[PDB]
């Protein structure tokens, strides 16, 4: 902490903070002995040899300055002595540290005040420069400055709270006052105030602060914010202030987390009345809330959440192409940019490395040709800034649309990993039709006419490899085995610019609510009464206990956040 020296020339005084080891230099100053007061504990880590280091600690904070002393006795010559007077103070900057990384790591958590608790506001609570609603303190992190000092302390000292200027645009701090008709919060630190003096009284006092983050982790922000309290010595009013003790805490800003479809749903939003009827029935069977949206939301939006030990809230993430409320967050950033090209896998363990929140998937090209499309880097960097879900890259530029979710989806399962990966498989659809022709049903209509088509086979051969390419990537990135992947029939054709398009209604990109699957209905209800595509899809999934219904197909789903605490991962 500080360095104390002694001399016979003048009496020496020092202030020591409880818990901080204070260095005392008795050597190199006019054999010696040390006799500390009963209120002071002194040890050694005497021939005035500089290698002899004396460490001071104090038992308790004092109510008066200069209450304790250490008697220094030097010793042929006349007696030589020095008088050291110590003041005991307790200063501690407290924050929620126990709740770096890991289940045994330490550090504070700070959330972005991105919701809109003020119902009359048109902006986020982080954008207002103020606290107008007491409910908003539920989202903010609590910090307490606890001091116990002599009654006359801070006559010669002052306390200053500050943050680094590089962080001044990322954090705002409020101080909570007292009174009867009000208990106002007040702005301490912010875009115009990197530091502020605290009028802390002497004796015992606790001062309370409310902290908000102003931005998510991103390219320009690793996610750590440090708050420092500085004790300055102003005993000499003719000279600049000096520093004698500092303390600080570090906050980690929680990442935005994407929720996979394997998490139990909480609310469908319906932004096609017969479709809505089936969704109402499906939502009912699944015990989900359904919200019709009569008249303020888009299908382009994605729904994530922020997790903390004190407050958890959902956050909408909105398209690059404002909808917010109390405990309902909103974040923005910035062909393949539409969030239909975003997906997140279930939790996986890959060769010993655990991904408890799964991994973020998106589609891209195989190489940067002049025509190949890409997802804007600003979004890739934003998503990668949240290390907790390690994004991966898939191949989707072969599709006319490019949305990765066009060929793959996940469903729950009762065993093994608890889920299955469903991929489009022209191989299975071909066999399905060819088997029916081989059994004598080639005259069925939506089959032998399309099986004979050479162009269709060549187009599906090209696509076949385009999909298997991702099959291998996912097995490597997610650690999947073939026994965990289900082939869903689906044929493709190439159109203008030779991009892949679905031959018949997509059998994935379905609405999944728990164990109830809102599968798009294929237009083949002519083959032997029961569409062969419907029976094949059902047969593949029925052993899993999942309930398949086909809807003759503008919506979103909010889902339960993870029970795992993201800050406990490495």
């Amino acid at each position: 902490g500080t360095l104390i020296r002694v001399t016979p020339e003048q009496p020496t005084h020092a202030v020591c903070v409880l818990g901080t080891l204070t260095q005392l230099d008795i050597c190199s100053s006019a054999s010696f002995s040390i006799n500390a007061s009963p209120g002071v504990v002194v040890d050694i880590a005497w021939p005035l040899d500089p290698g002899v280091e004396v460490t001071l600690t104090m038992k308790a904070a004092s109510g008066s300055t200069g209450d304790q002393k250490v008697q220094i006795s030097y010793y042929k010559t006349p007696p030589v002595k020095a008088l050291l007077y110590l003041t005991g103070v307790e200063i501690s900057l407290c924050a929620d540290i126990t709740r770096t990384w890991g289940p045994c790591g330490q550090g504070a958590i700070l959330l972005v005040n991105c919701d809109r608790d003020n119902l009359e506001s048109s902006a986020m609570d982080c954008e207002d420069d103020e606290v107008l609603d007491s409910e908003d303190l539920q989202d903010m992190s609590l910090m307490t400055l606890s001091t116990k000092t002599p009654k006359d302390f801070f006559t010669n000292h002052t306390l200053v709270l500050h943050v680094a200027r590089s962080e001044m645009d990322k954090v705002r701090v409020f101080q909570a006052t007292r009174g009867k008709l009000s208990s106002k919060c007040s702005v301490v630190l912010g875009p115009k105030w990197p530091s502020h003096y605290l009028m802390v009284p002497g004796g015992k006092h606790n001062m309370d602060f409310y902290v908000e983050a102003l931005a998510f982790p991103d390219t320009d922000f690793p996610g750590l914010i440090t708050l420092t309290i500085s004790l300055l010595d102003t005993s000499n009013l003719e000279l600049p202030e000096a520093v004698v003790f500092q303390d600080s805490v570090v906050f980690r800003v929680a990442p935005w987390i994407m929720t996979p479809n394997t998490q139990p749903p909480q609310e469908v939003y319906a932004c096609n009345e017969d479709f809505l009827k089936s969704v109402t029935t499906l939502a009912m069977k699944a015990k989900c809330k359904l919200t019709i949206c009569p008249e303020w939301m888009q299908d382009e939006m994605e729904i994530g959440y922020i997790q903390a030990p004190h407050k958890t809230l959902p956050v909408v993430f909105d398209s690059p192409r404002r909808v917010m409320g109390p405990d309902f967050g909103y974040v923005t950033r910035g062909g393949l940019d539409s969030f239909g090209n975003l997906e997140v896998s279930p939790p996986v363990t890959v060769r010993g490395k655990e991904y408890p929140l799964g991994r973020i998937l998106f589609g891209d090209s195989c190489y940067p040709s002049n025509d190949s499309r890409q997802m804007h880097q600003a979004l890739q960097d934003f998503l990668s800034a949240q290390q907790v879900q390690a994004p991966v890259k898939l191949y989707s530029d072969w599709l006319s649309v490019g949305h990765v979710d066009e060929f793959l989806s996940f469903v729950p399962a009762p065993d093994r990993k608890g889920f299955r990966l469903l991929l489009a498989s022209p191989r299975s659809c071909y066999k399905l039709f060819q088997e029916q022709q081989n059994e004598g049903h080639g005259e069925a209509l939506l089959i032998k006419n399309i099986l004979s088509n050479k162009t269709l086979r060549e187009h599906n051969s090209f696509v076949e490899r385009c999909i298997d390419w991702n099959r291998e990537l996912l097995k490597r990135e997610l650690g999947l085995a073939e026994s965990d992947i289900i082939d869903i029939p689906q044929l493709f054709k190439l159109k203008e610019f030779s991009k892949a398009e679905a031959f018949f209604p997509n059998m994935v990109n379905m609405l999944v609510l728990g164990k109830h699957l809102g599968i798009p209905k294929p237009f083949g209800p002519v083959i032997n009464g029961r569409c062969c595509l419907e029976e094949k899809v059902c047969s593949l999934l029925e052993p899993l206990g999942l309930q398949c219904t086909f809807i003759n197909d503008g919506t979103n789903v909010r889902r339960k956040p993870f029970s795992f605490k993201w800050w406990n991962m490495v």
Partner: antibody
Amino acid sequence: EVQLVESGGGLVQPGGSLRLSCAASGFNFYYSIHWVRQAPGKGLEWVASISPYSGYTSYADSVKGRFTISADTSKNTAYLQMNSLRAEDTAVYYCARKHPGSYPFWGWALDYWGQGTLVTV
Amino acid sequence: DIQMTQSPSSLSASVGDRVTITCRASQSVSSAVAWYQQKPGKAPKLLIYSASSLYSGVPSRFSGSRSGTDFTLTISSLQPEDFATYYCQQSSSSLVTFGQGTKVEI
């Protein structure tokens, strides 16, 4: 352990005053606090509100100038100071926290209603 | 002021009957209404906290919706414990108002 309790009622003579309080248990007192009274034979009448950590308050028109609402955030306790009480103010007085709305229309309710106090003038 | 109008003032139904209570707003309030159930001698209880937003913990027997300027509370089938006085709240401004209260009798 999560509940609101109220006290400070009793019999007062016309023209006098009473100091009602609502203490929180198991609750950090961060939410706005509301008082609602029900005279015998009548329905619910909202009285007043406070936002503790911003000092915004609101009163019903029938009690403006007569009632004052206040709170001690260090004791998680709200206070309603009723002066110049009239016979018309006889009622059972309840206290409740605000409860937030939800998408798409954010209108708000009252929750964890306490036992209320009996105010007789 | 924003006056709540409830109708009817009282109901008469038996156990197993389906009943509805309607309330009319005096202004175009943005679905911001709530429904409370008061047991005799007890504080009011919250059932619905925005139009169609059922409060957590309430049995599925209770539901309601907006219909233009009117709001409706529905009980799919009255149970022996569902007979109470119901109130409708319109928290649309700094001045909160409640309706008159509708009592459901057996």
